């Protein structure tokens, strides 16, 4: 049914105290986790892995809910699908391969994690590259008309179950599609190798993984932004040497200057934008490798 | 469907759009009633009667919705801008042979109502606007906590046919939770259950459901740079207006909802009304008595 999109990888349940982990590993090296984010799951990754995994052990994990990694109960607060709760269970993932110490790239939700990790324990990571976001304050921060109908779905999917759940019922497969269309540089299914589609199209006919990406974004307009906010307020700063690449016609550009923006957020940030729109590991994959490996290694 | 208008006619008045539809009782001067979404003009049926005490009273279903005609949108979603609406229902009148009428409506009549008096302020001999603020001070105050209170003003808005495709799965849901949602009780008690079927009816036809989002994607665009220009132009709507609005309504959230109409009208009264969105339904006797007065001198 679904490709093996990464050959040679190994496949890893890795069992947390808030369920299991999965993950292909692939590459020796440093370690270096990479997280997609949404309607996505790992294989995301699929065609920048292997030019990592020639200098990295690169570990494309599915987050917490999503993919195939288990998906812990939420609660009221959303509270295992806020960024902090899900960067406290990657790193958990992490230590039991033996790695507190990593590189880190996420990408959307992902990326949203990478960058709560780095300010949450920053001493888990070498280096940080986010690709294609701001910060999740800096989203509702500038939320107007414009960033309102661009990214709808952060005020759409945060409703109250069970709406956007029985609406996103209402055709899961034209919404996944629909999503990875509308945020490419191509507008339509192009940019993606079918395969992956068709993981990120059966991950999403589950109405479970569903409901979960649905608590990400609840906890998104919610816990999320609570802990940006502090964060913001307090000054505290991501340490972490960061890459933040985005897609010249990506969501982050929009809101504002992501470089610009990063820099409030991280003390030491590089930045470049990627001919691509949102899902620059697919869209833009020679251009996003090349990043990465050049600020990692 | 049950007739919730005892002793009203109805009528089917052509215009150059389509025909209206309408429940017409009463006698004595011209008062328009337009309903919003999600229902038709069976909304009023529990303030008209006591309003064709004193007024011919003309209870019309927006172009598009109910029994009206749904004249085919465009990219531009003319038909379905509050400007195009509002010269549609002129027209709708002037087939009575009422030039100069009274106006009251509410939720997207009320956007109908103040953009015809914005317009055509000569038609008005005086106008009701239930519930609502101008598009423009929506959007204006479109930050975090108004953008998920009223994310359907984004979701809506979205690019055909994704809110039709999400909604089709399961239009009985949509409109109940819509219709619950914005009551002061979040349930469906407010309302009379035949109403609530002719509005499930409604909604139950998929280009009625292709309409409505229509009218959001006009919202999200032609009718907020409508307002834009006028209010940036410093226009006003002279026709003497009240603003009523929910204590537990939509306008009420994004602002003080008297202090934002004295910025768009010249001559505006309103008051709060124990309700929510719903006014008419939730709190008949309230707004009936609130319209009567006012219309009546």
């Given at each position: ?11 890893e349940?890795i069992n947390t105290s808030?369920?299991?982990i999965?993950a292909?590993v692939?590459?020796?090296?440093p370690p270096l986790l990479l997280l ?20 990295f052990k690169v570990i494309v994990a599915?987050?917490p ?21 899900m960067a406290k269970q990657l790193i958990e993932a992490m230590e039991q391969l033996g790695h507190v110490h990593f590189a880190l790239?996420g ?6 994690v990478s960058?709560?990790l780095?300010?949450?324990s920053?001493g888990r990571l070498s ?171």
């Amino acid at each position: 049914d679904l490709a093996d999109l990464f050959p040679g990888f190994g496949s890893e349940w890795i069992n947390t105290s808030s369920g299991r982990i999965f993950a292909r590993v692939g590459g020796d090296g440093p370690p270096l986790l990479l997280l997609h984010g949404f309607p996505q799951t790992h294989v995301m990754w699929h065609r920048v892995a292997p030019k990592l995994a020639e200098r990295f052990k690169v570990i494309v994990a599915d987050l917490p809910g999503y993919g195939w990694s288990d998906m812990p109960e939420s609660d009221e607060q959303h509270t295992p699908y806020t960024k902090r709760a899900m960067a406290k269970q990657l790193i958990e993932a992490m230590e039991q391969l033996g790695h507190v110490h990593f590189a880190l790239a996420g990408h959307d939700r992902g990326a949203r994690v990478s960058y709560r990790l780095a300010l949450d324990s920053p001493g888990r990571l070498s280096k940080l590259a986010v690709l294609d976001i701001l910060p999740t304050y800096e989203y509702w921060q500038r939320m107007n008309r414009a960033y309102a109908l661009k990214i709808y779905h952060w005020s759409f999917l945060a409703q109250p179950a069970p709406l956007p759940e029985n609406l996103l019922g209402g055709d899961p497969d034209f919404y996944v599609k629909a999503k990875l269309a509308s945020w490419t540089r191509a507008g339509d299914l192009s940019a993606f190798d079918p395969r992956a589609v068709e993981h990120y199209r059966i991950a999403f006919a589950d109405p479970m993984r569903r409901h979960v990406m649905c608590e990400d974004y609840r906890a998104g307009a919610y816990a999320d932004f609570e802990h940006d906010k502090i964060d913001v307020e307090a000054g505290n700063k991501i340490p972490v040497p960061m890459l933040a690449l985005w897609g010249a016609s990506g969501i982050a550009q929009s809101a504002a200057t992501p470089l610009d923006v990063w820099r409030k957020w991280a003390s030491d940030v590089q930045g470049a934008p990627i001919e691509s729109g949102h899902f620059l590991p697919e869209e833009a994959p020679d251009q996003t490798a090349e990043a990465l490996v050049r600020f990692f290694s």
